[PDB]
Design a protein around this motif. Structure first.
Motif, short mmCIF file in Angstrom:
data_model
loop_
_atom_site.label_atom_id
_atom_site.label_comp_id
_atom_site.label_asym_id
_atom_site.label_seq_id
_atom_site.Cartn_x
_atom_site.Cartn_y
_atom_site.Cartn_z
N UNK A 58 1.04 -1.26 0.18
CA UNK A 58 -0.02 0.19 0.08
C UNK A 58 0.92 1.11 -0.66
N UNK A 59 0.59 1.74 -0.99
CA UNK A 59 1.24 3.06 -1.06
C UNK A 59 1.01 4.25 0.00
N UNK A 60 0.21 4.65 0.04
CA UNK A 60 -0.36 5.83 0.57
C UNK A 60 -0.53 6.01 2.27
N UNK A 61 -0.04 6.58 2.87
CA UNK A 61 0.33 6.76 3.92
C UNK A 61 0.01 7.48 5.54
N UNK A 62 -0.60 9.09 4.70
CA UNK A 62 -0.58 10.25 5.32
C UNK A 62 -2.38 9.99 5.46
N UNK A 77 -8.85 23.77 -1.19
CA UNK A 77 -8.90 24.06 -3.07
C UNK A 77 -9.20 23.14 -3.30
N UNK A 78 -7.94 22.41 -2.89
CA UNK A 78 -7.75 21.04 -4.19
C UNK A 78 -8.64 20.16 -3.96
N UNK A 79 -9.04 20.16 -2.19
CA UNK A 79 -10.13 19.45 -1.53
C UNK A 79 -10.90 19.78 -2.24
N UNK A 80 -11.49 20.80 -2.47
CA UNK A 80 -12.65 20.94 -3.62
C UNK A 80 -12.19 20.96 -4.79
N UNK A 118 -12.26 9.61 -5.49
CA UNK A 118 -12.58 9.00 -3.74
C UNK A 118 -11.14 8.52 -3.22
N UNK A 119 -10.10 9.77 -3.75
CA UNK A 119 -8.87 9.19 -2.82
C UNK A 119 -8.73 10.40 -2.14
N UNK A 120 -9.11 9.07 -1.31
CA UNK A 120 -9.16 9.60 0.61
C UNK A 120 -10.14 11.02 1.17
N UNK A 121 -10.37 11.45 0.50
CA UNK A 121 -11.43 12.52 0.93
C UNK A 121 -12.53 13.11 -0.95
#
Lengths: 1582, 108
Positions: free
Chosen positions: A899-903, A1156-1159, A1166-1169
């Motif tokens: 698994x690559x995502x860690x934050x 803003x990038x979350x927006x 669906x990459x975490x948020x």
């Protein structure tokens, strides 16, 4: 096809408000409503002067049950309400001071006045319900006779009487005169006629009341044969002896033999009906009624289990088959070849039927309404006209329909009752659009149900009540109205009935408060209406819409009917009559006022003109003039609708569609650049129990090498965070370098080659099939490796870059046997290195860390298995290779994480157990293939130049260059808003269902059953005579009836067996004619302004004018023309959950681009948020932005078109447009991040509504860190006009730039979006004591203020917010539907950011469900009921009475509380009231502006009474099975429209699931078929 | 509306028979006293597959005449009646009533 709207339930209330009045009405709901709202209106004066509103009736004091009066008063009369019980001790302490309305007996109120604790000066409104009863009359005889007329008229409370419709009484008319005179003498009120009866008498053309005599029946052979066999059947049936002691003779069934019914009653009724139909209608009608009775009697055979009932019913069915045989043989006797069966009906019909046919033939658009008293007569009559229309070409153009009075009992047969009600609604629908012109009704269609305008009403039966006669008379509403009554020596009786009923019309219509214009007065109006010119706003246009005198009253009526309203808000014009004497001539003057829902609240003043109708026409003329002067009526004189309204053009340009838009569109489908170090320091290791690998923890900070970022642009500082790998939680910091590194081209090439080797062969985060080019205009960010300096710093590891450049093609290759023979071992080489295998997977190697060196393990040591004894034997068996040097120790390896995502900020350390330790999908396969333990041999494995500790620092960088390519668009958005803003720097369940059903059925009971008891007392009672004597007016009856008799025999009612100067002079009799000749001159008409000048000269020449008061015209005008009457009738707060904490726009860095990038990141990737956290609040901002602005631009424009404007600006198409003009479309990411296909290292189709799903979310991006106010400036960046505009030039203020200042244009214009201006008070001051009246309206509202926790600075918006749409007395301000309109959005934000900022962190679906459950009209209704706001509000509407009555019956049986709407929750989320919901919302408008735009004040005030139930909804949050089924397939499973089958009894519902198919389920009804379709979809899917 | 079809069905099934005694009953004036009605009606019962029930009512008239109702078990059923001071005369009257009743349904 239209009708003039009259002032029904308005003139009744106005006449009940002004003078002492008596109202007689049919329904008990409407009388109780008029009494209730009169108590509500008079409580405004009862509140200040310390007085008591009372209700006197006879239903009080009967039971401890709350009767209908108490429960309706404690809901709708938003006041303090008490009702006497039969057995209380009547506490005298404060029950008449702490209760606004007390409901007492006449005896109870009499004894209360006798004790002198309550005085007659301390009561305001007396209302006597049903005082026309003689028992009630004798009850109130001492009450009036000892107290009321001995009291002075200044000490008299206002008296309203309620009565049954006493006109229908069957007594003689001198008794009715004694009734009216004696009841007026005793109760001291004028009788206003006040019913549907008299508005349809006055305001509709009274029909010619015709008597049509019919001859007695002649008999033929078939008729005596049928009558003979039926008379034989009556001979047998009356001859038959019935006795339970004879049929059964059992002594133990003493109570059961009485319950056995008589088997002769139904035969007697059936054959008596056939006998009277033979007597009066004919053998054809008798054979049809016998067929109907056979259809009844064969089922009645099925129902009974008794034997004697069965043989008697078989005997009656036998008789009916006999009658059918004789009649069908006789009709087939005359049915020859070419013989007319029309004439066969004609010969056998009675003269009553043929006379009805003559009445029909006299009517060659038709609307015929025929009544009767029996349902089977209606059915056989319907079949007569059907068979006639299918046989007579003369009557072929006739379409007929019948309707019976067979509302069944729902407690026994509810399904058949539903069938009859559905049939009734269907035939009323088929009748009201004039599809069938002829309807045949029964008594149920006399009252309650309305019909359109008819031209012929035929009564088969002469009724025994006047209410039936005059309702039949009124149902013919159109101008050629004809009220025909048929009769078949009964002519004298019908003549006496007609004369009696026209006498009742004479002493009822003339006994009114409004009266009619007489016919000679109507002709006077016709000759008078030509004296004035037509008022035209466009007089130059020939075909312009014109207002004359005559059609002006119709145009004002249409304008009053065109204002937006529900079914029960009813708005009408209000004209008041005043006579003025001028030069000895009586000239009536008419004032006119529009309702409050129209902003013209001031009275419009007419001039005195000698006749009534001409003065009313002048009042309507000046009203239309003032209407077009203000602007409510357009040039075409059509009153303004919601669609046709147009706002100001500075707010209309946002609705213009885009050129691309104009699945439907808009729907749901060598430089010293910056250097930074990535410092990683472990702060929380993995626990020992969580370490399933059982290996040493490897921190990243023991590594001598780390990574650095080389950027041409300046990196802003960000918040600290951590990375959560298998080793644990590691704090991450971005260390700023103290020195700047120059660039060289060869080192640039080496760095780019290192990046290619890292992203293609080390980390593989740049997958193949795409191309790479290390020169991009968009950013120049490089990633470099560094090694920690011995001095404490970090310097660039150029040697590692050279090693990577020389080792760019490192692949596992086959080491030869001689080299492995010559290969030694070094533990320092294999200390913290990375091993790959070359014996297997040469093209795609797997990389392993070094964990443990085991000197006890060897190739000579035992392999973990019995099939392979040693590791060497295992290798030579599975792969056929020989290990040369076997004396060396083996190697323990550790596999890399899958698994690559860690934050995923601050929730990976607890999410490591979520999926099996980075989800390890290759671990099970490789442990099956390589036998669990991956003990390797170092000579047969290769070593990578990448260290294992540097590898563990390198795996925690998943989003690297797609991150950088994405996180510049957000900073560009930040730069744009900081440029145009100023802030920011630019650089069980079945038991529950059955209990709910039983509570609902047993608790409704104040509904259409009251309408059925009205239907019961419709044609039965007509009772309660009081007294009649020998007065001489009796002889005044006897002659006049004879005079009325001489009308009927002579008026065609009984039919046997066969110079402009002159009209100007009469127009103004008190004005000299030479002045009129001066004004006229060459012209031919007198304008209105000429009449203003003449009346102004008359007031100037004669300064003393006078006024007098009559009419049903309201004192609801007052003030503007009355009260004063001084000679003028010519002319006119914690920081937690804090909304108000706007941070400073000076010195703020602005938003971080991560939000803003979350927006810009959606839920589709669906990459975490997802955006749905922000847009869920963002949509609710736009309303709170737009509507409040629309409160301030169009203050004197009502909300019914501002709703259309808000629905146009808040619309998803509008946000599509507004987001497209900013061109945000390349800015969102709508593609899944995956490097093989859709990533370019240095497109996305987006749906329509999804663009809107960004844009509103964008304001969510500026919700917190910018506060609200600068967030408003972001729609100033959008162009959504919310903030007012000031146009200026370059001010040159060197202190700071203006917050909200824009870039200058070529004309150096500078726009400032300043503060929201505070609104003006709605308190209009046409009167000089509107403040005094506003103080005089609301005594008891300080209890309302302490109940909330808020004290008002101003009762203006509170008094408006406490005031119904149809509340015309509160003339100072408008109604509560303008503070509903913005208060709902303000409380919608208060609830929404309460639901978003809380640390529970709900899902987007959970937040949507918590919004749609926590926001509805029912929850505001619930907190209105529970916390005692059935105590303050004001209201004026008819059926709100019974609706809100039954509503607090529901609540108080439950005990106010919540649980009914807490079931309605997911019983309808998956509208009994409106007003008292929005009442609790209406105050949310007022405290929105009494607190001067303070959301924190409103939330702090409402928090203490909102907190436990929002806590309860925070206990009902965690998910749902319906929410389960909508998180699997929200859009995918769609339930289609039902389709009827060939049988016509079954319904099929098909649900389609995409990429799965269509599943269809059948059922008897729609819900069962939908459930079957859902179960079929679940069976195929789950 | 199913009982309109039942009325038409009863009319058709009692106008569909082609018995000689039914034609004689329609031809013969049934007011004649020479015709036995009990025996002829029992013959009609045996011919037309139904069963005549002489339900003799225990309650007589108020004038003192014994009452008896007959049931003709057709499809649909029929019930006729008669009265008379003795059982034989009352049964003869009831049978005459049912025979003239069948004369109605045998009328074309």
């Amino acid at each position: 096809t239209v009708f003039t709207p009259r002032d029904f339930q308005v003139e009744l209330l106005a006449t009940a408000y002004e003078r002492n009045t008596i109202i007689c009405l049919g329904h008990r709901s409407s009388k109780e409503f008029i009494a209730l709202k009169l108590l509500q209106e008079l409580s405004r004066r009862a509140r200040r002067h310390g007085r008591v509103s009372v209700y006197l009736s006879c239903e009080v004091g009967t039971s401890t049950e709350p009767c209908s009066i108490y429960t309706m008063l404690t809901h709708l009369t938003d006041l303090r309400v008490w009702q006497e019980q039969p057995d209380m001790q009547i506490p005298f302490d404060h029950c008449w001071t702490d209760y606004h309305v007390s409901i007492l007996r006449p005896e109870g109120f009499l004894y209360l006045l006798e004790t002198r604790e309550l005085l007659l000066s301390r009561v305001e409104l007396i209302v006597l319900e049903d005082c026309h009863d003689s028992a009630v009359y004798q009850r109130i005889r001492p009450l009036f006779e000892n107290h009321i007329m001995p009291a002075p008229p200044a000490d008299r409370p206002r008296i309203l009487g309620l009565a049954g419709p006493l006109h229908s009484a069957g007594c003689e008319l001198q008794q009715l005169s004694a009734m009216l005179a004696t009841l007026e003498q005793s109760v001291l009120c004028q009788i206003e006629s006040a019913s549907d009866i008299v508005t349809v008498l006055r305001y509709c053309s009274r029909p010619h009341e015709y008597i049509v005599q019919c001859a007695p029946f002649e008999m033929d052979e078939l008729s005596l044969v049928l009558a003979d066999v039926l008379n034989t059947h009556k001979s047998f049936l009356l001859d038959h002896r019935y006795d339970p002691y004879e049929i059964y003779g059992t002594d133990q069934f003493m109570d059961e033999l009485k319950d056995i019914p008589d088997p002769k009653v139904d035969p007697l009724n059936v054959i008596n009906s056939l006998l009277v139909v033979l007597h009066e209608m004919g053998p054809w009608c008798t054979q049809r009624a016998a067929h109907h009775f056979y259809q009844c009697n064969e089922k009645l055979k099925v129902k009974t289990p008794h034997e004697r009932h069965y043989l008697l019913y078989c005997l009656v069915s036998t008789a009916l088959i006999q009658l059918y045989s004789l009649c069908e043989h006789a009709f087939h006797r005359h049915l020859g070849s070419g013989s007319d069966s029309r004439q066969t009906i004609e010969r056998y019909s009675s003269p009553k039927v043929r006379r009805l046919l003559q009445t029909l033939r006299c009517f060659k658009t038709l609307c015929a309404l025929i009544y009767c008293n029996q349902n089977h007569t209606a059915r056989v009559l319907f079949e007569l006209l059907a068979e006639i229309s299918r046989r007579d070409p003369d009557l072929k153009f006739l379409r007929c329909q019948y309707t019976t009075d067979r509302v069944a009992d729902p407690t026994t047969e509810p399904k058949e009752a539903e069938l009859e009600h559905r049939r009734q609604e269907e035939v009323l629908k088929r009748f009201r659009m004039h599809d069938c012109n002829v309807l045949i009704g029964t008594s149920v269609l006399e009252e309650g149900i309305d019909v359109p305008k008819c031209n012929l009403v035929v009564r088969w039966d002469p009724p025994t009540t006047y209410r039936s006669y005059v309702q039949c008379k009124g149902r013919a509403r159109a101008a050629p109205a004809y009220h025909v009554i048929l009769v078949a020596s009964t002519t004298k009786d019908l003549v006496h009935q007609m004369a009696q009923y026209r006498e009742i019309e004479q002493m009822l219509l003339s006994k009114c408060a409004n009266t009619e214009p007489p016919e000679q007065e109507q002709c006077e109006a016709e000759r008078f209406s030509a004296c004035l010119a037509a008022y035209r706003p466009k007089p130059h246009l020939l075909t312009g819409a014109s207002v004359d005198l005559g059609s002006a009253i119709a145009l004002v009526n249409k304008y009053c009917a065109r204002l937006p309203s529900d079914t029960f808000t009813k708005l009408t014009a209000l004209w008041r009559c005043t006579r003025n004497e001028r030069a000895g001539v009586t000239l009536f003057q008419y004032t006119l006022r529009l309702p409050i829902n129209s902003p013209l609240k001031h009275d419009i003043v007419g001039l005195p003109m000698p006749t009534q109708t001409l003065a009313r026409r002048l009042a309507a003329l000046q009203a239309c003039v003032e209407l077009h002067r203000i602007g409510e009526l357009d040039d075409q004189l059509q009153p303004i609708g919601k669609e046709g309204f147009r706002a100001l053009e500075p707010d209309w340009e946002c609705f213009e569609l885009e050129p691309e838009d104009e699945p439907r569109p808009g729907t749901t489908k060598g430089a010293p650049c910056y250097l930074y170090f990535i410092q990683l320091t472990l702060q929380c290791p993995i626990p020992e129990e969580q370490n399933t690998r059982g290996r040493k923890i490897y921190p990243p900070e023991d590594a001598q090498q780390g990574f650095g970022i080389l950027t041409t642009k300046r990196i802003p500082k960000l918040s600290a965070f951590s990375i959560f790998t298998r080793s644990g939680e590691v704090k991450v910091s971005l260390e700023l370098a103290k020195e700047r590194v120059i660039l060289t081209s060869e080192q640039i090439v080496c760095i780019n080659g290192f990046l290619n080797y890292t992203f293609t062969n080390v980390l593989r985060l740049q997958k193949f099939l795409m191309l790479f080019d290390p020169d991009s205009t968009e950013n120049c960010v490089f990633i470099v490796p560094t090694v920690k300096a011995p001095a404490g710093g970090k310097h660039i590891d150029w040697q590692f870059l050279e090693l990577i450049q020389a080792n760019g093609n490192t692949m596992p290759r086959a080491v030869p046997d001689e080299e492995r023979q010559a290969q030694p071992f070094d533990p320092q080489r294999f200390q913290d290195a990375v091993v790959m295998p070359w014996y297997r997977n040469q093209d795609q190697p797997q990389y392993f860390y070094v964990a443990e060196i085991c000197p006890h393990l060897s190739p000579l040591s035992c392999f973990p298995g019995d099939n392979y004894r040693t590791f060497k034997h295992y290798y030579l068996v599975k792969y056929g290779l020989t290990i040369q040097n076997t004396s060396q120790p083996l190697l323990d390896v550790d596999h890399t994480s899958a698994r690559l995502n860690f934050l995923t900020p601050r929730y990976v350390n607890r999410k490591g157990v979520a999926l099996p330790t980075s989800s390890e999908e290759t671990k099970r396969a490789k442990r099956e293939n390589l036998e669990q333990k991956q003990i390797l041999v170092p000579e047969l494995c290769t070593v990578h130049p990448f260290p294992a500790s540097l590898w563990r620092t390198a795996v925690c960088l998943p989003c690297i260059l797609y991150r950088i390519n994405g996180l510049l668009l957000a900073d560009d958005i930040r730069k744009q808003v900081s440029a145009d803003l100023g802030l920011g720097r630019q650089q069980t369940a079945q038991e529950v269902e059955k209990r709910q059903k039983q509570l609902s059925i047993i608790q409704a009971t104040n509904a259409n059953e009251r309408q059925y008891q009205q239907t019961k007392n419709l044609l039965i009672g007509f009772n309660f005579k009081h007294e009649d004597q020998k007065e001489p007016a009796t002889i005044r009856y006897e002659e006049s009836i004879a005079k009325l008799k001489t009308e009927i025999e002579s008026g065609g009612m009984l039919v046997p067996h066969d110079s402009m100067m002159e009209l100007l002079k009469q127009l103004l009799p008190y004005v000299n004619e030479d002045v009129l000749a001066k004004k006229l001159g060459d012209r031919r008409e007198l304008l209105l302004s000429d009449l203003v000048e003449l009346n102004a000269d008359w007031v100037a020449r004669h300064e003393q004018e006078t006024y007098n008061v009559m009419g049903c015209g309201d004192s609801f005008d007052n003030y503007n023309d009355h009260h004063r009457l001084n000679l003028d009738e010519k002319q006119l707060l914690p920081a937690g959950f804090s909304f108000d904490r706007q941070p400073d726009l000076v010195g703020h860095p602005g938003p971080s681009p991560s939000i803003i990038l979350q927006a810009l990141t959606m839920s589709n990737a669906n990459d975490g948020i997802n955006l749905e956290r922000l847009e869920t609040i963002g949509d609710s901002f736009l309303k709170y932005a737009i509507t409040t602005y629309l409160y301030i631009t169009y203050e004197n424009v009502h909300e019914g078109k501002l709703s259309h404007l808000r629905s146009k600006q808040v619309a998803n198409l509008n946000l599509y447009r507004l987001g497209r003009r900013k061109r945000l479309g390349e800015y969102m990411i709508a593609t899944k991040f995956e490097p093989h296909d859709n990533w370019l290292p240095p497109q996305h189709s987006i749906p329509d509504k999804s663009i809107a799903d960004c844009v509103e979310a964008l304001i969510g991006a500026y919700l917190i860190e910018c506060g609200p106010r600068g967030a408003l400036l972001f729609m100033a960046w959008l162009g959504v006009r919310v903030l007012p505009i000031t146009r200026q030039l370059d001010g040159g203020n060197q202190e700071q730039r203006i917050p909200g200042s824009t870039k200058p244009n070529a004309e150096n214009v500078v726009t400032v979006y300043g503060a929201w201006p505070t609104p003006r008070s709605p308190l209009l001051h046409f009167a000089p004591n509107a403040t005094e009246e506003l103080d005089q309206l609301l005594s008891g509202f300080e209890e309302f203020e302490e109940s909330l926790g808020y004290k008002f600075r101003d009762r203006s918006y509170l008094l408006q917010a406490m005031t119904h749409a149809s509340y015309t007395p509160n003339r100072l301000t408008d109604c509560y539907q303008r503070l509903e309109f913005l208060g709902d959005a303000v409380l919608d934000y208060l609830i929404t950011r309460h639901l978003y900022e809380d640390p529970r962190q709900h899902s987007p679906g959970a937040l949507t469900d918590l919004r749609s459950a926590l926001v509805n009209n029912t929850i505001f209704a619930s907190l209105a009921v529970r916390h005692g706001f059935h105590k303050f509000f004001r209201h004026l509407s008819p059926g709100l009475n019974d609706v809100i009555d039954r509503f607090v019956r529901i609540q108080q049986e439950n005990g106010h509380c919540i649980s009914e709407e807490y079931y309605l929750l997911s019983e309808e989320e998956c509208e009994v009231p409106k007003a008292l919901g929005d009442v609790f919302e209406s105050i949310a408008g007022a405290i929105f502006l009494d607190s001067n735009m303070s959301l924190d004040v409103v939330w702090h005030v409402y928090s203490n009474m909102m907190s436990p139930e929002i806590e309860q909804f925070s206990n009902s949050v965690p998910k749902s099975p319906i929410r389960e089924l909508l998180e699997l397939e929200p859009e995918t499973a769609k339930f289609g429209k039902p389709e009827k089958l060939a049988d016509g009894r079954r319904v099929r519902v098909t649900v389609d699931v995409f990429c799965k198919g269509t599943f269809r389920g059948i059922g008897r009804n729609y819900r069962i078929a939908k459930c079957t379709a859902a179960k079929c979809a679940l069976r195929q899917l789950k | 509306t199913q009982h309109s079809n039942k009325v038409s069905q009863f009319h058709k099934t009692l106008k569909n028979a082609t018995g000689k005694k039914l034609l004689k009953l329609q031809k013969t004036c049934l007011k004649n006293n020479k015709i036995d009605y009990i025996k002829l009606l029992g013959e009609i019962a045996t011919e037309n597959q139904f069963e005549v029930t002489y339900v003799d009512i225990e309650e007589k008239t108020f004038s003192g005449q014994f009452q008896c109702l007959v049931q003709l078990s057709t499809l649909p059923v029929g019930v006729c009646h008669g009265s008379g001071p003795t059982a034989a005369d009352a049964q003869r009257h009831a049978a005459q009533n049912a025979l003239e009743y069948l004369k109605i349904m045998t009328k074309k």
